[PDB]
Design a protein around this ligand. Sequence first.
Ligand SMILES: Cc1nn(C2CCOCC2)cc1-c1nc2nccc(-c3ccc4c(c3)CCC[C@@H]4NC(=O)c3nc(C(C)(C)C)no3)c2[nH]1
Length: 271
Amino acid sequence: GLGYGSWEIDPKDLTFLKELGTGQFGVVKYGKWRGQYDVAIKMIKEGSMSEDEFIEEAKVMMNLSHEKLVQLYGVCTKQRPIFIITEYMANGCLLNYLREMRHRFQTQQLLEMCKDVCEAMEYLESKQFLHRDLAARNCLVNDQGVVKVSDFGLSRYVLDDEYTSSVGSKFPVRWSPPEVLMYSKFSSKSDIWAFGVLMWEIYSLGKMPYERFTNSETAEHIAQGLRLYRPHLASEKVYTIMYSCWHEKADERPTFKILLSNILDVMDEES
Ligand SMILES: Cc1nn(C2CCOCC2)cc1-c1nc2nccc(-c3ccc4c(c3)CCC[C@@H]4NC(=O)c3nc(C(C)(C)C)no3)c2[nH]1
């Protein structure tokens, strides 16, 4: 009503029910909107976000819609802390889901998770919109086992130098290409490299990439041409696709449209 924009949700319409976890912007909770509809609510901790810049960008993010992207519903900005309201995903983050051995996933199921994420990324690529922190920890799973991409773009609004600096403790070193580590040069092709590492995470059931190395050692080894190698559950055809993401030259890595075609082809050959 009066005083609320299209983007704005009235926080008094929210009921808070459970805590889901804590991350870069603070606490995230599960709740209901108008006593009926499941939602997730990010409560943005004081000092953690460039708030005015995010609010202006939220207008662009409200127009991004795809079945394999976590859906933004709105924001609450007339009070602090500000809230970000999204679709609720009942089975939690992909990294923890992969690590639960009781699921005993079949190889067909693993390739379907890769396809879910590739569909989302092809859509963002079509709108020239980078994720910038693609990894299994930033994907979520719903009650039907469908994987969706979460928190795309939000890296631009983090005020913590240990996350933003390429030599900081929280920087995603193990998901980054050589030109990001050396010159901090981000592009569609750095999202491509990260997607290859995510495919490796899926087929490895959530092991840490380069698990015997530090971040510093990983950066040096990548520069010398070392790469991750084939997980036991990945076929030769699947490993070819993930490895194509790691070409030293950025312009020789595929697009997400090409990767999606390749994944569909392997599904037809291995199903
Ligand atoms: C967990 C969980 N368990 N369960 C069930 C499992 C079965 O038993 C009952 C509980 C459900 C969930 C669950 N559903 C969800 N739906 C929507 C969103 C979230 C969500 C998304 C992101 C984050 C969290 C939560 C919590 C930790 C921090 C994290 N990152 C950011 O906040 C952040 N990171 C960045 C960047 C990438 C910019 C650093 N920005 O914000 C959801 N979590």
